[PDB]
Design a protein around this nucleic acid. Structure first.
Ligand SMILES: [Mg+2]
Ligand SMILES: [Zn+2]
Lengths: 36, 66, 86, 1223, 552
DNA sequence: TCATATTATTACGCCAGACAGGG
DNA sequence: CCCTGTCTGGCGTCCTCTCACCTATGA
RNA sequence: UUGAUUUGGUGAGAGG
């Protein structure tokens, strides 16, 4: 819940968290307003 | 880009555990390069404490006592 | 214990300083027995004795004179893992 | 009428469509191919005779001797198949070839030879095929798998997008020979035509035309049509056929006959072409700016001065016209280079060409092919005249000539094997036509463009390699031949043919070890069509489209049985009805439809024929005459499933099984499963272990009979008759007189193969299913093999399954099993392990087979004889001694005595010993002490095994409950196995539920018959209920003729039905749902398929009634006590100091790269430090750690890993000085 | 080293060094003999190529080979590649004190502990058992202890339960992608041969139970036991590091047990009776006097912590059901009652655990995750939530929708015979009307499933959401979506051929009706493309993770 | 047994990176 | 001399399990 | 001082 501690490797957890959902991803007129 | 950026590092073991080792070892050899270890995979190669986790206090101590 | 790893080119004086003996003959081993080749790729004098603290051919079968090299053996006298670093 | 094991238990067969063609013999690819290879077939095609008629008669280079051929033969094998598997020899036959040497005098092409000699020489041994489609190569039983490769003959491929990065298409054209050099033509983005041979350097393609003795004018005659400029009254008028103006801009004034036809500015329309053809317009006067860009066709020379005006293929300017007009050449031939249609590709290639005549063309081709070594007239001419034009080194086969004439729209289909001039010119013309627009490319996945190699073709190609090596040897010996002192074995040598053919049958990518744990798995490894192998594509490179299913797979290749993983769709399995074409393509049956009436004649088609016709669907309703009952029917025209009229169709599908294979047509309710789960279901159904008690799928498809017969695991009777039944050793069948030969009085004695090792350590065992004094017919079964029950196919067993969550024990895919499954031994399978012990003479004398085992005390001499080797049969486990096999001088004596591996038990079932002549036999030399001991573990079932149904419902059996805690219905019976309903909405394999309900109905009929027969009734009520059970519902094919079963065959049938009435639900024409409900109403079961169930724990009802039924669940051979492994400390490798890998090596787990990244992701710096230094590699660290642990001090003294110092020495062993710096 | 036999399987570097030395000896002898120029040029050139082949083989023209045509492996090929020293022996190592076996469930576990077999436990903990045996005094030398555990006497199992007790192990599923794929548990010994793994933790490992295998690793030293307990313990990983979402979300059986428990029906046993607490709500459910879903006024006492760290009790009567009170007996103190007052699908139970973690911290969220899993499994067992053939209700309007679409394609093709419209506009009109008919069939079956139950209470009828089994498996979010339940009842859309363009004739038959032959073949097009995509996609996904953790 | 020393197939798909060609 | 096809090198997922097969020559 | 060979390398197939 708190801030990142002095030390915790954030590059590796970040790289794993971007590359880990790599399996779930796939591989292969004019303007009309909506609200008011 | 990420593979050109991890192969262009100031630590040739970090850039040799990754892709092509021939290019990086000849560049480091003819440059006379030196690897002040200072990262995670140099210390996973050379067999010591990671300078991130629990070993960050150990590397604070070793960097303080130089 | 140690800081940075340094990589550089290998001078011929540096390669002769690494070395422990010139590997002449290409003959690997005897192949009909168990002995190697003197003095080929897998030498005795250039590297070390196969057996720990033993002259491979015949002298020193106890723990007293670790090092003597007779002319009949042309062999060093150290550990089994000594050849892995030489 | 039925045969006598058909009246034993006749399966209730749903299915409305009457089948017209019965299933072909499922191993016919392997058997027909190898029967083509070895057969004495005169007229030469195909076989070994083709090899001998290609290689023979050998004549040397005018050496005046010519060894010719007569006849060949194969003698008896010296070892029959059983003792061949036991001994370890190949199952081969000696190839006795008659050879007739005749030797000439001087000057005898026509003269009679001076002497002859002739003998039945011996070359090689070829491995024969066993009657089931297998080989026995070195003791082990292997299978050659049929390849799927590109056909010989031209292919026009496009590669439309990726090259040039500009959206400009290319068009290449590959002439693929069956044997020889590859010739490819290809455009380049400058619109120039390029040739390349064998993927070498790129030559501009018309040089090959200049290599075929074509001048430039002949080439321009071929690839261009002439436009005639006549020198006339003024401005050098033009012959103009109006076709050439199609779609271009009128640059000048188009007028003739005193009338202005088309003015400048407007494009020429086809109405203007009609105006010029109606007005008969040919000759029109052109401006001088029209000829100022055109190109001359042929050469012209100034007549009086005697020199050249212009070379052929030269563009024209006005001063060039002033040169040629004043000389006296009145006709000017120009090349019509239409920018829309008729492009100038050959002409611009001629402008790229650095050559001018034939000789420089051949010198440039020779400098392409073989570089460095000089290009002389004889050498380059011999090269190019033997590239494509000699019968030796270039040979399009009959398949290649058929595809080559078919892709060029030639009339004939048979021709010569080599190419010619006209063939290369036609390939270039069709390629140019495809560039212009007319005609189109070919695709490579189209199974009319994709041939099958099989066993006979591959072995014939390897045998031809061996024969050309032995003919080079015969040409060697003959020119050095002295006569008459040699007879034809100083010339010929049996070594290269045997070496090549054992190289293929032993170490090839397709001669591979047979998946033998199951009759299904044998019969579906023999019917396999691999895209891999030599000359084909690889696993790790290609691709997307060759891994995908193409609309020509309908009825040739199974769409759904392909292994998941790294090779999907490369390892396709062949369909049920699909034969192989004469040329090797895949032809499938269809029913010929002349008019409204669909005729019962069949007719086979391949994919290059299936496109032209219109082919109906298998299930389209036709009633009593063959007329389609609708006026419109779903068909498919050219790979496009579309709706056509009642009377347009020319063919109909034969039967509705024909799309899928014999692995995935055994799955009932296939049409309700998803495609993915049918794939996983068929691929797991190959993997089932044979249980100890075979048990008859209640919901089958009726294809169990054909698979269990056609795979040779059951002892099908050769000649019908009665029986004598000694049987302890062999079934003895007395033969009826009509099938019995006049001499050779003769009674057939069948050998039953009792408990023995399969290739997957399962147990292949045959048991007699006929009694004594009982009639059998020809083709009937006598002995049930592994996983068979009265001639049917019983892979797994049928068990009572509830669909509900039960207290979490079946959470993701787990399966919760009662104790009644494990008490009855109804999955307790039998595994057999062969263990060898040899006492080779490594060094310091030979090793020895004696009980006088050392250091070890009376814990060695125990399960053995009074003085050596495991006795016969006890309950040996792990750490025992089987064969005392230890040497002296190896105190200094040691224990190599082959023991029992860690964790296994068993009974020594057999001990074989063809040892070093002295143990106190037939085998090879070298090896001395040869003791093989056959254990047989009996593995039951346990928490951790893997079971699965037929639909893709995998499961690891989690809890083995007691009988009491099971969910019992109100009748009192516990349910056997609880599965999980949550798998069913996601994994859309809804067929397991209909199998569950229909199996519930099947056992409902079985319980009803078991009541009517246990509470025993006279047979009138049984035959009435059996007749009601076999009528049941819609219009079907079975009904029964039950009142002709002699009042005893009703009772024997009802004895074999009291475990449940077996129901055939065929593949796509299966049982509908209303018939399941109606069959559940014949039995006294509730119509919904769902019974209220109480709980065995609490005794109180589950709310909302649950599904109970019988699913046919299989035990796959992924058993948990072959996977459980642990390591604290043992042995390591040599080079590295890290632990070994595997289970058979007692090794530890590879803590790989992503686990190191996962420990770096935490703060696990100390866990990782011991994970890669102390636990793995550093030798001082691990010995200090083991002593620190056993002292009671959890503390590591790390040090440096050894493999990093190995890295330092391997890097340092280059010219690299890597070091370790300051303290 | 020699293999099993009488010959030496020699390495490739010995071939390389032996050739360089053979050539160097030849070159020294030729420079002794004073051979002419072209001989010693070829000799030195062969030595140059031999040295260049030793160092980095194959960088020069076609690489040399010994047996048979495969090139032999040089020094640079001992360094580079996937199988060099970096990627195969220095970044990843093989590891002692490690084990591997097939996993299975065991739902009795608390989420900090896992089941571990006795045979694997006695093999992985041999040195700790040796140290314990030597401490007691039962034996003397180390040999005696190795004979004792080789025999497995009656006293080493107490030694084993005294070395296990507070010693975590690292469980690891074999494709570890993120850091939640290595988690540390405490062992509980198992009669068996399969690792029993707590079910909630499975959603972190991507571990189903269809034949999976996991590796166990033992933290040897004392700092590693403390890192396994304080950083890598499974109670410590309850939030995914990629975001803020909880990773110990209850997966599939337990959300069905909750969705059947906290729901309602318009008449049951004990409709509209009043209850003095949740304890007698469970007592009325167990004795057989009310139903699990029967709407009822209860008196619950929710603790709202509105002060500064002080829990204030407020008790009131909530109009709720019986099941919501029974599930309120498990909720900790601080959460309000409205977290269970709704129907509790999967998103709602995930935000229940998330609000418990944000308010009450870690320890009530761990014990409440376990109590959620236990009560979900127990009432899913009591539910008897099967799946039948009658549960997939075919729309009665489905056949008329298909006939109206068939009349529309008949009109478009009758215009195509008379050439009024273009071919691309015909193909577009056919794909548009089959998309519209597909959406109408899906709405017909979705009405026919989501409100099919119509039961009266004391008079005229009144409708409600259905207790159909496949609809609770879809609406709960356990397993299933709109598309999968659509393909089991309504038509399964317009499948596409591998050309990338769609096919104008759809698959009008679902799976409860039978697919005929052509429709299944078009289905196999669509599914073979998906299997090929996953089995080739995984390589690029793994190589992307590698490039990312080596740039980081 | 103990030194002698290397030749007659093609059928991936990008994607950077270096190189001779030419307006 | 700045674009440019063209050619050459260098990537291409982790973990596990089962089986078989291993240079010729030679007075 | 009380004992021993696969890793090496290829090919084929399988599991998650
Ligand atoms: Mg799985
Ligand atoms: Zn000595």
């Amino acid at each position: 819940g708190h801030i990142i501690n002095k030390g915790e490797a954030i590059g590796v957890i970040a790289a794993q968290s971007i590359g880990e959902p790599g399996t779930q991803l796939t591989m292969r007129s004019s303007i009309q307003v909506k609200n008011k | 880009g990420i593979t050109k950026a991890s192969l262009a590092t100031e630590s040739f073991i970090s850039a040799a555990s990754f892709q092509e080792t021939t290019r990086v070892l000849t560049e480091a050899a003819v440059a006379g390069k030196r690897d002040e270890l200072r990262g995670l995979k140099e210390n996973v190669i050379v067999g010591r404490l990671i300078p991130a986790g629990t070993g960050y206090a150990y590397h604070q101590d070793r960097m303080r006592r130089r | 214990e140690f800081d940075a790893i340094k990589i550089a080119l290998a001078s011929p004086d540096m390669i002769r300083s690494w070395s422990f003996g010139e590997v002449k003959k290409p003959e690997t081993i005897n192949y009909r027995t168990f002995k190697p080749e003197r003095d080929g790729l897998f030498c005795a004098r250039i590297f070390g004795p196969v057996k720990d603290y033993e002259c491979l051919c015949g002298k020193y079968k106890r723990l007293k004179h670790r090092g003597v090299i007779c002319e009949k053996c042309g062999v060093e006298v150290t550990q089994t893992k000594v050849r892995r670093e030489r | 009428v039925y045969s006598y094991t058909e009246k034993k238990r006749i399966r209730k067969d749903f299915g409305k469509r009457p089948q017209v063609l019965d299933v072909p013999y499922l191993l016919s690819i392997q058997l027909d191919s190898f029967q083509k290879f070895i057969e004495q077939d005169p007229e030469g095609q195909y076989g070994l005779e083709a090899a001998f008629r290609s290689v023979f008669p050998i004549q040397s280079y005018s050496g005046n001797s010519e060894l010719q051929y007569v006849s060949y033969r194969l003698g008896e094998p010296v070892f029959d198949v059983q003792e061949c598997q036991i001994r370890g020899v190949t199952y081969s036959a000696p190839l006795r070839v008659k050879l007739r040497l005749v030797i000439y005098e001087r000057e005898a092409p026509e003269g009679t030879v001076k002497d002859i000699k002739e003998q039945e020489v011996y070359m090689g041994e070829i491995p024969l095929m066993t009657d089931n489609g297998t080989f026995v190569i070195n003791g082990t039983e292997r299978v050659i798998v049929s390849q799927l490769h590109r056909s010989p003959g031209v292919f026009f491929d496009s590669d439309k997008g990726k090259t040039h990065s500009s959206g400009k298409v290319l068009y290449n054209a590959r002439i693929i020979p069956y044997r020889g050099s590859w010739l490819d033509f290809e455009f380049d983005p400058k619109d120039n035509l390029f040739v390349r041979i064998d993927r070498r350097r790129k030559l501009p393609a018309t040089i090959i035309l200049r290599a075929l003795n074509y001048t430039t004018e002949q080439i321009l005659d071929l690839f261009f049509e002439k436009v005639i400029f006549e020198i006339r009254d003024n401005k050098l008028q033009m012959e103009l056929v109006p076709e050439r103006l199609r779609g271009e801009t009128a640059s000048f004034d188009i007028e003739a006959n005193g009338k202005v036809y088309v003015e400048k500015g407007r494009r020429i329309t086809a109405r203007h072409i009609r105006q010029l053809e109606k007005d008969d317009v040919k000759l029109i006067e052109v401006p001088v700016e029209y000829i100022a860009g055109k190109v001359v066709a042929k050469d012209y020379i100034d007549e009086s001065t005697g020199e050249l005006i212009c070379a052929a293929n030269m563009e024209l300017s006005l001063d060039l016209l002033a040169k040629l007009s004043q000389s006296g050449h009145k006709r000017i031939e120009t090349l019509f280079t239409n920018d829309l249609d008729h492009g100038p590709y050959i002409s611009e290639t001629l402008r790229v060409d650095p050559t001018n005549d034939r000789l420089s063309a051949l010198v440039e081709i020779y400098r392409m092919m073989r570089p460095g070594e000089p290009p002389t007239r004889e050498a380059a001419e011999s090269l190019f005249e033997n590239l494509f034009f000699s019968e030796d080194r270039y040979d399009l086969s009959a398949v290649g000539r058929m595809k080559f004439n078919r892709s060029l729209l030639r009339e004939e289909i048979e021709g010569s094997g080599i190419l010619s001039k006209d063939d290369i010119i036609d390939v270039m013309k069709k390629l140019i036509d495809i560039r212009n627009g007319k005609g189109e490319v070919d695709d490579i996945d189209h199974l009319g463009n994709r041939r099958i190699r099989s066993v006979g073709e591959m072995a014939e190609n390897q045998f031809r390699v061996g024969l050309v090596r032995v003919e080079r040897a015969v040409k060697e010996r003959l020119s050095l031949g002295d006569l008459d002192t040699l007879m034809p074995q100083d010339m010929i040598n049996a070594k290269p043919i045997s070496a090549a053919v054992k190289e293929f049958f032993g170490s090839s990518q397709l001669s591979q070890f047979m998946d033998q744990n199951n009759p299904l798995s044998e019969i579906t490894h023999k019917r396999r069509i691999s895209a891999l192998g030599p000359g084909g594509l690889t696993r790790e490179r290609a691709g997307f489209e060759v891994r995908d299913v193409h609309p020509t797979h309908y009825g040739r290749v199974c769409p759904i049985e392909t292994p998941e993983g790294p090779n999907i769709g490369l390892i396709n399995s062949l369909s049920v009805y699909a034969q192989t074409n004469e040329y090797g393509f895949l032809e499938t049956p269809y029913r010929k439809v002349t008019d409204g009436v669909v005729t019962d004649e069949i007719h086979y088609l391949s994919a290059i024929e299936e496109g032209n016709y219109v082919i109906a669907q298998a299930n389209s309703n036709l009633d009593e005459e063959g007329h389609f009952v609708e006026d419109l029917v779903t068909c498919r025209s050219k790979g496009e499933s579309s709706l056509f009229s009642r009377d347009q169709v020319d063919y109909m599908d034969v039967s509705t099984q024909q799309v899928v294979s014999v692995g995935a047509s055994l799955i009932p309710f296939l049409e309700h499963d998803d495609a993915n789960r049918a794939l996983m279901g068929a691929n797991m159904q190959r993997q089932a272990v044979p249980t100890l008690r075979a048990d008859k799928p209640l919901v089958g498809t009726g294809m169990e009979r054909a698979v269990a017969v056609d795979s040779g695991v059951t002892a099908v009777a050769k000649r019908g008759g009665v029986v004598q039944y000694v049987d302890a050793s062999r079934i003895v069948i007395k033969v009826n007189e009509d099938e019995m030969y006049p001499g050779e009085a003769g009674i057939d004695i069948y050998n039953l193969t009792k408990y023995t090792r399969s290739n997957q350590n399962t147990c292949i065992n045959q048991m007699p299913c006929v009694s004594l004094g009982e009639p059998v017919e020809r083709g009937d079964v006598l002995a049930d093999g592994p996983s068979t029950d009265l001639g049917e196919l019983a892979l797994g067993q049928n068990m009572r399954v509830a669909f509900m969550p039960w207290n979490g024990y079946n959470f993701e895919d787990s399966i919760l099993v009662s104790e009644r499954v494990v008490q009855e031994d109804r999955f307790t399978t039998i595994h057999i392990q062969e263990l060898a012990c040899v006492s080779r003479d490594t060094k310091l004398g030979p090793e020895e087979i004696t009980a006088d085992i050392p250091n070890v005390g009376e814990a060695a001499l125990s399960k053995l004889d009074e003085s050596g080797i495991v006795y016969i049969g006890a309950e040996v486990t792990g750490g025992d001694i089987l064969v005392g096999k230890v040497t002296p001088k190896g105190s200094d004596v040691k224990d190599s005595s082959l023991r029992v591996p860690n964790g296994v038990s068993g009974t020594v079932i057999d001990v074989q010993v063809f040892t070093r002549d002295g143990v106190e036999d037939d085998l090879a030399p070298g090896v001395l002490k040869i003791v093989k001991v056959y254990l047989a573990v009996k593995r039951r079932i346990q928490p951790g095994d893997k079971m699965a149904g037929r639909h893709g419902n995998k499961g690891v059996i989690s809890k083995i409950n007691p009988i009491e805690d099971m969910p019992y219905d109100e009748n009192g019976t516990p349910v056997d196995i609880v599965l999980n309903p949550l798998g069913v909405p996601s994994r859309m394999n809804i067929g397991q539920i209909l199998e569950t309900h229909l199996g519930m109905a099947a056992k409902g009929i079985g319980d009803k018959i078991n009541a009517m027969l246990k509470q025993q009734q006279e047979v009138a009520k049984l035959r009435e209920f059996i007749q009601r059970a076999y009528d049941l519902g819609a219009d079907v094919r079975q009904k029964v003729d039950l009142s002709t079963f002699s009042d005893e065959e009703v009772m024997r049938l009802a004895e074999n039905l009291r475990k449940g009435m077996p129901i055939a639900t065929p593949v796509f024409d299966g049982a509908k749902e209303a018939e399941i409900k109606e069959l559940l109403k014949l039995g006294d079961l509730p119509t919904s398929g769902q019974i209220r169930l109480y709980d065995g724990r609490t005794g109180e009802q589950f709310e909302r009634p649950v599904t109970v039924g019988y699913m046919y669940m299989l035990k796959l051979n992924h058993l948990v006590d072959d996977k459980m492994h642990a390591r604290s400390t043992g042995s390591y490798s040599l080079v590295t100091q890290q632990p070994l890998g595997g289970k058979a090596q007692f090794g530890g787990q590879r803590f790989g790269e992503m686990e190191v990244w996962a420990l770096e992701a935490y703060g696990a710096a100390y866990t990782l430090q011991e994970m890669l230094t102390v636990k793995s590699d550093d030798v001082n660290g691990r010995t200090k750690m083991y002593k620190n642990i056993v002292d009671g001090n959890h503390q590591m003294e790390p040090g440096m890993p050894e493999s990093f110092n190995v890295l330092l020495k391997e890097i340092r062993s280059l010219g690299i000085n890597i070091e370790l710096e300051d303290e | 080293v020699p293999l099993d036999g009488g010959r030496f399987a020699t390495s490739d570097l010995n071939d390389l060094y032996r050739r360089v030395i053979n050539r160097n000896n030849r070159l020294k002898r030729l420079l002794d003999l004073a051979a002419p120029d072209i001989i010693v040029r070829n000799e030195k050139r062969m030595l140059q190529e031999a040295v260049d082949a030793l160092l980095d083989n194959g960088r020069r023209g076609r690489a040399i080979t010994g047996s048979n045509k495969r090139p032999l492996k040089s020094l640079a090929d001992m360094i580079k590649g996937k199988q060099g020293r970096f990627r195969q022996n220095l970044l990843g190592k093989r590891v002692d004190y490690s084990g591997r076996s097939v996993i299975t469930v065991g739902p009795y576990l608390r989420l900090h502990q896992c089941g571990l077999p006795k045979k694997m436990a006695l093999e992985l903990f041999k040195p700790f058992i040796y140290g314990k045996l030597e401490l007691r005094g039962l034996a003397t030398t180390i040999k005696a202890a190795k004979k004792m555990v080789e025999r497995e006497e009656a006293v080493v199992w107490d030694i084993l339960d005294e070395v296990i007790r507070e010693h975590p192990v690292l469980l690891n599923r074999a494709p570890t992608l993120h850091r939640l794929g290595i988690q540390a548990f405490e062992p509980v010994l198992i009669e068996g041969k399969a690792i029993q793994l707590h079910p909630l933790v499975c959603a972190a490992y991507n571990a189903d139970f269809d034949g999976d295998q996991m590796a166990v690793h033992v933290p040897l030293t004392l700092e590693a036991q403390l890192e396994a307990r304080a950083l890598m313990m499974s109670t410590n990983n309850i939030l995914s590091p990629a975001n803020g979402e909880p990773i110990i979300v209850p997966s599939q059986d337990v959300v069905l047990g909750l969705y059947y428990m906290t729901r309602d029906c318009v008449n049951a046993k004990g409709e509209g009776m009043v209850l003095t607490g949740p304890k007698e709500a469970e007592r009325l459910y167990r004795s057989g006097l009310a139903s699990l879903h029967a709407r009822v006024k209860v008196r619950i006492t929710e603790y709202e912590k509105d002060a500064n760290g002080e829990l204030v009790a407020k008790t009131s009567l909530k109009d709720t059901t019986v099941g919501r009170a029974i599930l309120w007996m498990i909720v900790p103190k601080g959460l309000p009652y409205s977290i269970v007052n709704q129907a509790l699908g999967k998103k709602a139970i995930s935000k229940m655990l998330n609000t418990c973690y944000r308010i009450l911290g870690l320890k009530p969220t761990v014990i409440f995750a376990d109590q959620i899993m236990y009560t979900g499994f127990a009432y899913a067992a009591r539910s008897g939530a099967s799946v039948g053939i009658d549960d997939m209700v075919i729309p009665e309007k489905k056949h008329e929708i298909i006939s109206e679409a068939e009349a529309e394609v008949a009109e478009i093709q009758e215009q195509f015979q008379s050439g009024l419209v273009t071919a691309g506009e015909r193909y577009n009109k056919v794909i548009d009307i089959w998309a519209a008919a597909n959406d109408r069939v899906s709405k017909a079956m979705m009405d026919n499933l989501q409100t099919e139950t119509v039961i009266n209470r004391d008079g005229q009828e009144e409708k409600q959401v259905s207790f159909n089994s496949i609809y609770m498996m879809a609406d709960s979010g356990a397993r299933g979506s709109a598309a999968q339940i659509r393909q089991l009842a309504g038509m399964r859309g317009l499948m596409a051929k591998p050309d990338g363009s769609i096919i104008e004739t759809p698959i009008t038959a679902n799976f409860r009706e039978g697919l005929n032959v052509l429709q299944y073949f078009i289905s196999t097009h669509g599914a073979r493309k998906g299997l090929a995509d996953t089995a080739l996609k995984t390589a690029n996904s793994g190589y992307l993770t590698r490039r990312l953790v080596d740039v980081a």
